[PDB]
Structure 1
Amino acid sequence: MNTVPFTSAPIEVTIGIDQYSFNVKENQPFHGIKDIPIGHVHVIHFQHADNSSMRYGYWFDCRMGNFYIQYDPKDGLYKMMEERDGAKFENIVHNFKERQMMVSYPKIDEDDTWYNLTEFVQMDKIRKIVRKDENQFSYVDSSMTTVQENELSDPAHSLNYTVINFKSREAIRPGHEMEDFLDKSYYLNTVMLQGIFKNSSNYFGELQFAFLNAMFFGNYGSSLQWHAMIELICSSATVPKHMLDKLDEILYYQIKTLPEQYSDILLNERVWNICLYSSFQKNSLHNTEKIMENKYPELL
């Protein structure tokens, strides 16, 4: 179990850690988050009480270093940093624990939600989507645009998701126009899985990362990416059986976790009705279809 200490909390802020969140008052004696499960990526995220605009946060994996938070004034935002002095770090954390100034990561023993949402998400892949090579952790916020959004403007602050475009020469083989547009199996299996992602685990990892950025930061381009990656699978007649079964589990836990009041903006009616009722895979997502029909029957 690892710890992310906070130097201080000078401004009132709602702090998220994965799917949990708590309010911290201006200059409240808050010094961080303990008992963070090892083995998973995590995200620590922020919404200032004064400007609910620009949710932001940091993806990290405590196996990769000792990380802490401190409100640097230059930029006006809580910043993640790495402490390279391991003895200085252990000594800081132990004092803050002894003074009980840390919240505990509040995982229920039975509860596999975070695992189920991050099963295929790897820090090394996050860092290729979010390019800032001098840090081991990755910054994401509500406003950041995707590489594809930039093609339709600062390249350093972009989300480098894999570009998917159903009406593109990459997606459509000369001579197979109708076939490839109506059955995207070629594009899924040969172009994307064999060629770009290499395996379905990396595909699912990017899909899960896109969803989480959409949910936690309201990042619109991430929502576009999540839906595009679902739609590419559902619009393929030929998908490995294990991929369809895993997709149904992935989406089930995503839909289960989504705040009920954010469904209007985070769920694309057209994609979901096509995927669950028109597509080749309309009958292959039983768990996802069941929770969608019981939780968001209006969208459908």
Structure 2
Amino acid sequence: MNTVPFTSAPIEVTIGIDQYSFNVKENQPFHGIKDIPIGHVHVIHFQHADNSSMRYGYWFDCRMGNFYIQYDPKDGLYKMMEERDGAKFENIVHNFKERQMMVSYPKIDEDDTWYNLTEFVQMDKIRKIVRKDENQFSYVDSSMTTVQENELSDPAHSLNYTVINFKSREAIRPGHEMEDFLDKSYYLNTVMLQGIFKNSSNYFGELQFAFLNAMFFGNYGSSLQWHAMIELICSSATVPKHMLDKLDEILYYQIKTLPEQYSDILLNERVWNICLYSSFQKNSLHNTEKIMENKYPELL
């Protein structure tokens, strides 16, 4: 079990740690989050009380270093930092724990939600989507645009998701126009899985990361990416059986975790109706179709 200490909490803020959240008051004696499960990536995220504009946060993996949070009054945000002095860090944490100044990562033993949302998400792949090589952790916020959004403007602050575009020479083999546009299996299996992602685990990892950024930061381009990656699978007639079964599980837990009140902005009616009712895979997503029909029947 790992710990992310806070130097202090000088501004009132709602702090998220994965799917949990808690409110911290201005100058409240808060000094961090303990008992964080080892073995998963995590995200620690922030929404200031005085300006709910810009949700922002940090993806990290406690196996890759000792990380802490410190508010910067010049840039006006809570910043993640790495402490290289291991003994200084252990002594800081032990003091804050003895004074019980830390919240406990509140995981129910039965509860596999976070695993199910991050099964294929790796910190090394996150750091290729979010480029800032001097840090072991990755900053994301509500406003960051994707490479594909910038093609249609600061490149260093972009989300370098894999560009998917159904009307592109990459997606469409010369002479197979109709076939490839109506059945995207070539684009999924040859171009994307064999060519770019190398395997379905990396594809699912990017899909899951895209969803989590959409959910936690309201990042619009991430939501676009999540839906495009779903649509590419659903619009393929030929998909490995194990990929379809895993996709059904992935989407089930995503739909389950979505805040009910954000479904209007996080779910694209067209993609979901197409995927569940018109596509090649309309009959292959049983768990996802069942939770969608019981939780968001209005969208459909």
TM-score by length of 1: 1.00
Q: In structure 1, what is the Cα distance between the partners aligned to 2:258 and 2:237?
A: 28
SS at match of 1:35: strand
Question: Which 5+ residue runs of structure 1 have no aligned equivalent?
Answer: none
SS at match of 1:174: coil
Alignment-derived partner of residue 198 in structure 1: 198
User: Could you list the per-position Cα deviations for residues 1-28 of structure 1 after superposition, in whole angstroms to 9, with x for gaps in the alignment?
Assistant: 0000000000000000000000000000
User: Could you list the per-position Cα deviations for residues 145-200 of structure 1 after superposition, in whole angstroms to 9, with x for gaps in the alignment?
Assistant: 00000000000000000000000000000000000000000000000000000000
138-147 or 71-80, larger mean C-alpha shift: 71-80
Alignment-derived partner of residue 233 in structure 2: 233
SS at match of 2:21: strand
SS at match of 2:164: coil
Per-residue deviation, 1:80: 0.1
User: Could you list the per-position Cα deviations for residues 37-70 of structure 1 after superposition, in whole angstroms to 9, with x for gaps in the alignment?
Assistant: 0000000000000000100000000000000000
Q: In structure 2, what is the Cα distance between the partners aligned to 1:124 and 1:74?
A: 30
Per-residue deviation, 1:283: 0.1
Q: In structure 2, what is the Cα distance between the partners aligned to 1:267 and 1:72?
A: 35
SS at match of 2:136: coil
Alignment-derived partner of residue 18 in structure 2: 18
Alignment-derived partner of residue 81 in structure 1: 81
Per-residue deviation, 1:264: 0.3
SS at match of 1:140: strand
User: Could you list the per-position Cα deviations for residues 262-292 of structure 1 after superposition, in whole angstroms to 9, with x for gaps in the alignment?
Assistant: 0000000000000000000000000000000
User: Could you list the per-position Cα deviations for residues 215-252 of structure 1 after superposition, in whole angstroms to 9, with x for gaps in the alignment?
Assistant: 00000000000000000000000000000000000000
SS at match of 1:57: strand
Q: In structure 1, what is the Cα distance between the partners aligned to 2:50 and 2:143?
A: 18
Per-residue deviation, 1:35: 0.1
SS at match of 2:22: strand
Per-residue deviation, 1:73: 1.4
Q: In structure 1, what is the Cα distance between the partners aligned to 2:251 and 2:152?
A: 28
How many residue pairs get aligned? The number is 300
Alignment-derived partner of residue 157 in structure 2: 157
Alignment-derived partner of residue 179 in structure 1: 179
Q: In structure 1, what is the Cα distance between the partners aligned to 2:154 and 2:72?
A: 23
Q: In structure 1, what is the Cα distance between the partners aligned to 2:75 and 2:283?
A: 50
Percent of paired sites with the same residue: 100
Alignment-derived partner of residue 127 in structure 2: 127
Per-residue deviation, 1:72: 1.1
Q: In structure 1, what is the Cα distance between the partners aligned to 2:198 and 2:180?
A: 20
Q: In structure 2, what is the Cα distance between the partners aligned to 1:153 and 1:262?
A: 27
SS at match of 2:101: coil
User: Could you list the per-position Cα deviations for residues 62-116 of structure 1 after superposition, in whole angstroms to 9, with x for gaps in the alignment?
Assistant: 0000000000112100000000000000000000000000000000000000000
Q: In structure 2, what is the Cα distance between the partners aligned to 1:75 and 1:184?
A: 45
Q: In structure 2, what is the Cα distance between the partners aligned to 1:97 and 1:141?
A: 30
Q: In structure 2, what is the Cα distance between the partners aligned to 1:24 and 1:99?
A: 17
SS at match of 1:256: helix
Q: In structure 2, what is the Cα distance between the partners aligned to 1:55 and 1:236?
A: 35
Alignment-derived partner of residue 9 in structure 1: 9
Q: In structure 1, what is the Cα distance between the partners aligned to 2:104 and 2:261?
A: 27
Per-residue deviation, 1:296: 0.1
Q: In structure 1, what is the Cα distance between the partners aligned to 2:21 and 2:265?
A: 21
User: Could you list the per-position Cα deviations for residues 116-167 of structure 1 after superposition, in whole angstroms to 9, with x for gaps in the alignment?
Assistant: 0000000000000000000000000000000000000000000000000000
SS at match of 1:21: strand
SS at match of 1:275: helix
SS at match of 2:160: coil
SS at match of 1:46: strand
SS at match of 2:143: coil
SS at match of 2:68: strand
Q: In structure 2, what is the Cα distance between the partners aligned to 1:179 and 1:77?
A: 50
SS at match of 2:291: helix
Q: In structure 2, what is the Cα distance between the partners aligned to 1:91 and 1:231?
A: 49
Question: Which 5+ residue runs of structure 2 have no aligned equivalent?
Answer: none
Q: In structure 1, what is the Cα distance between the partners aligned to 2:292 and 2:53?
A: 29
What is the root-mean-square deviation in Å for CA atoms of aligned residues? Answer: 0.2
TM-score by length of 2: 1.00
Aligned ranges for residues 215-226 of structure 1 at < 5 Å? 215-226=215-226
